[PDB]
Design an enzyme around this catalytic site. Structure first.
Site, short mmCIF file in Angstrom:
data_model
loop_
_atom_site.label_atom_id
_atom_site.label_comp_id
_atom_site.label_asym_id
_atom_site.label_seq_id
_atom_site.Cartn_x
_atom_site.Cartn_y
_atom_site.Cartn_z
N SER A 3 0.86 -1.19 0.00
CA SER A 3 0.00 0.00 0.00
C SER A 3 0.89 1.23 0.00
CB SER A 3 -0.99 -0.09 1.16
OG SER A 3 -1.77 -1.27 1.07
N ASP A 42 -7.89 -2.88 -7.02
CA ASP A 42 -7.46 -2.62 -5.65
C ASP A 42 -8.55 -1.90 -4.87
OD1 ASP A 42 -4.40 -2.54 -4.24
OD2 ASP A 42 -5.93 -1.23 -3.36
N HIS A 91 -6.78 -6.17 -1.24
CA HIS A 91 -5.84 -5.13 -0.81
C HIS A 91 -4.67 -5.80 -0.12
CE1 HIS A 91 -4.55 -1.10 -0.08
NE2 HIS A 91 -4.60 -1.21 1.24
C1 LIG Z 1 -3.73 1.27 3.27
N1 LIG Z 1 -3.79 2.12 2.10
C2 LIG Z 1 -2.64 2.92 1.73
O1 LIG Z 1 -1.66 2.86 2.38
C3 LIG Z 1 -2.69 3.83 0.49
C4 LIG Z 1 -3.79 4.12 -0.28
C5 LIG Z 1 -3.57 4.99 -1.37
C6 LIG Z 1 -2.29 5.43 -1.52
S1 LIG Z 1 -1.39 4.69 -0.22
C7 LIG Z 1 -1.88 6.29 -2.54
C8 LIG Z 1 -0.48 6.42 -2.77
C9 LIG Z 1 -0.02 7.26 -3.78
C10 LIG Z 1 -0.93 7.97 -4.56
C11 LIG Z 1 -2.30 7.83 -4.34
C12 LIG Z 1 -2.77 6.98 -3.31
C13 LIG Z 1 -4.30 6.82 -3.05
C14 LIG Z 1 -4.65 5.47 -2.38
#
Ligand SMILES: CNC(=O)c1cc2c(s1)-c1ccccc1CC2
Ligand SMILES: *[C@@H]1O[C@H](CO)[C@@H](O)[C@H](O)[C@H]1NC(C)=O
EC number: 3.1.1.98
Length: 356
Positions: A145, A253, A302
């Site tokens: 993530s 995702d 995820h």
């Molecule tokens: C546990 N969910 C995460 O850690 C992340 C979700 C996202 C992330 S990180 C993200 C990273 C770079 C650019 C755009 C995004 C939008 C969605």
């Protein structure tokens, strides 16, 4: 178990100024080192980080971290659970900077929070050299993530760090899991007030400047000042890295659908949402055509690499641990050992091995 070590350099801190750290399990008979970057979204202003401090404090502070952590999935040492790198040295780097591992600004009289994600990785690699990393043969920087995006943002800096310190034999590589996002348009417009349901573009734009975040050098020179937010998106920053990076990404995702404001309740999906979802899978598939080492199952899920059942999913009959092993072999066209594995069926869970 992995044992907690707080950074000896106490100037490299989490959000609230408490010291950052890392969990370590040494493997004296191995020259392979796996450094995993934890994920967990981010925060882009003072008042939104304040809310994160109330209910997600462990992602902003080390004051309550446990002394040990169980290595799971790719961080497991049992070959049954980790056929890939069960014998490697395991490093878990907790995510306590809320900056997608990009920040390099310290807390002062002008900043309520410190955002030092980029310096945390640097300091961990630095301090690990005295505990066996100096004799390493491969350093695999992995993450899920936000940690997956952090791999893309930091893998070349870690490689640059090791040469400049006199370790050219350490082959630095990256493994980015569920951090390959699209700056596409949401299915239904929303008001960007939080981190979960905001447009992925504008959230990074305000965060990167709140954090004083840093991006890889070649990508920074292409998009230039004011447009560094572009380097937070895999398909734009990946072509600029020299280090080998294996990309693991669900075609659908959950975090991508969340920021796109898509919520699958269970009712029959209408044509508009059906086309939106099929177009999203096609777009991700397109961005990975030129990524030679990739694993992209057509599932709605995820993260994967630190889940204990990460061995189950398969693309075209090949599991992720096998593809990662084939990737290792390619870096020494392999017969029966593929490395580019992207599903072509266009709907969530059309791959039968998707997590249930
Ligand atoms: C546990 N969910 C995460 O850690 C992340 C979700 C996202 C992330 S990180 C993200 C990273 C770079 C650019 C755009 C995004 C939008 C969605
Ligand atoms: C601690 O880290 C900071 C930030 O990278 C650096 O400026 C400082 O020199 C470091 N101190 C030591 C003793 O390594």
């Amino acid at each position: 178990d992995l044992r907690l070590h707080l950074l000896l350099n106490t100037s490299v801190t989490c959000n609230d100024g408490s010291p950052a750290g890392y969990y370590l399990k040494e493997s004296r008979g191995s020259r392979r080192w796996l450094l995993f970057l934890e994920g967990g979204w981010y925060c882009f202003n003072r008042e939104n980080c304040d809310s994160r401090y109330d209910t997600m404090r462990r992602l902003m502070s080390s004051r309550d971290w446990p002394r040990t952590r169980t290595g799971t999935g790719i961080l497991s040492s049992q070959p049954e659970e980790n056929p890939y790198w069960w014998n490697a040295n395991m490093v878990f780097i907790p995510y306590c900077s809320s900056d997608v591992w990009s920040g390099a600004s310290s807390k002062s009289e002008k900043n309520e929070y410190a955002f030092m994600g980029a310096l945390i990785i640097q300091e961990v690699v630095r301090e690990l050299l005295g505990r066996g990393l100096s004799g390493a043969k491969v350093l695999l920087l992995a993450g899920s993530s936000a940690g997956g995006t952090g791999v893309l943002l930091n893998v070349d800096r870690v490689a640059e760090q090791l040469e400049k310190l006199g370790y050219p034999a350490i082959q630095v590589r990256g493994l980015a899991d569920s951090g390959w996002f699209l700056d596409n348009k949401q299915y239904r417009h929303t008001d960007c007030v939080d981190t979960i349901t905001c447009a992925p573009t504008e959230a990074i734009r305000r965060g990167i400047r709140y954090w004083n975040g840093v991006v890889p050098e070649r990508c920074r020179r292409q998009f230039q000042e004011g447009e560094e937010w572009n380097c937070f998106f895999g398909y734009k920053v990946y072509p600029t890295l020299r280090s080998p990076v294996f990309v693991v990404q669900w075609l659908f995702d959950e975090a991508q659908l969340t920021v796109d404001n898509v919520h699958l309740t269970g009712q029959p999906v209408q044509e508009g949402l059906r086309l939106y979802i099929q177009n999203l899978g096609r777009e991700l598939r397109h961005t990975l055509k030129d990524v030679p080492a990739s694993f992209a199952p057509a599932c709605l899920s995820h993260e994967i690499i630190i889940r204990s059942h990460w061995t189950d999913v398969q693309v075209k009959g090949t599991s992720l641990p096998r593809a990662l092993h084939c990737w290792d072999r390619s870096l020494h066209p392999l017969k029966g050992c593929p490395v580019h594995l992207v599903d072509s069926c266009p709907w969530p869970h059309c791959n039968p091995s998707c997590p249930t």
